[PDB]
Amino acid sequence: KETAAAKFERQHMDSSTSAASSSNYCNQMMKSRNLTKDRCKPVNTFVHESLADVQAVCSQKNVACKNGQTNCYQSYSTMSITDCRETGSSKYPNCAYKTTQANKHIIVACEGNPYVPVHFDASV
Ligand SMILES: [Rh+]
Ligand SMILES: [Rh+]
């Protein structure tokens, strides 16, 4: 299958741009990363940093995950992100999203050998 690490990359990594400047970024990205295929994924975050910089977060500040697991890690430095949030008017299969650009600390859950990001928990 798609590995948990690969799925994290597909759902959450967009190293190609510095920041979603485009009001329409989320409509395009949610579609092309297959997050609209079965339903409208209601919220999703994309990270505009190198893969190495996001993998390195698995070595940074250990914090509790939202689900109570202990394997979450907060970035020491702020990172360029985009939050995608489904609009009130969005109706599957025309998934519609508000695109919000921010510089925030990310929190990711890490798993495996090697120890890599598998889940995007939060930004702060
Ligand atoms: Rh997850
Ligand atoms: Rh999941």
Swiss-Prot record:
Q: Decide whether keyword Phosphoprotein is in the record.
A: no
- What's the reported outcome of changing H12A? Loss of activity
Q: Which reaction does it catalyse?
A: an [RNA] containing cytidine + H2O = an [RNA]-3'-cytidine-3'-phosphate + a 5'-hydroxy-ribonucleotide-3'-[RNA]; an [RNA] containing uridine + H2O = an [RNA]-3'-uridine-3'-phosphate + a 5'-hydroxy-ribonucleotide-3'-[RNA]
Q: What class of enzyme is it?
A: lyase
Name the organs or tissues of expression: Pancreas.
Where does it reside? Secreted
Q: Which UniProt keywords apply?
A: Disulfide bond, Endonuclease, Glycation, Glycoprotein, Hydrolase, Lyase, Nuclease, Secreted, Signal
Cystine bridges: C26-C84, C40-C95, C58-C110, C65-C72
Identify the EC number(s): 4.6.1.18
Specify the glycosylation sites in chain numbering: K1, K7, N34, K37, K41
Which amino acids does the record list as binding substrate?
K7, R10, K41, P42, V43, N44, T45, K66, R85
Q: Name one GO biological process term.
A: defense response to Gram-positive bacterium
Q: Which GO terms describe its cellular component?
A: extracellular region
Active-site residues from the entry: H12 (proton acceptor), H119 (proton donor)
Instruction: Tell me a Gene Ontology molecular-function term this record carries.
Output: ribonuclease A activity
Oligomeric state and interaction partners are given as: Interacts with and forms tight 1:1 complexes with RNH1. Dimerization of two such complexes may occur. Interaction with RNH1 inhibits this protein. Monomer.
Family note? Belongs to the pancreatic ribonuclease family.
What functional role does this protein have?
Answer: Endonuclease that catalyzes the cleavage of RNA on the 3' side of pyrimidine nucleotides. Acts on single-stranded and double-stranded RNA.
Q: What is this protein called?
A: Ribonuclease pancreatic
Instruction: Name the source organism.
Output: Bos taurus
The major lineage groups are: Eukaryota, Metazoa, Chordata, Craniata, Vertebrata
| Gene name per UniProt | RNASE1
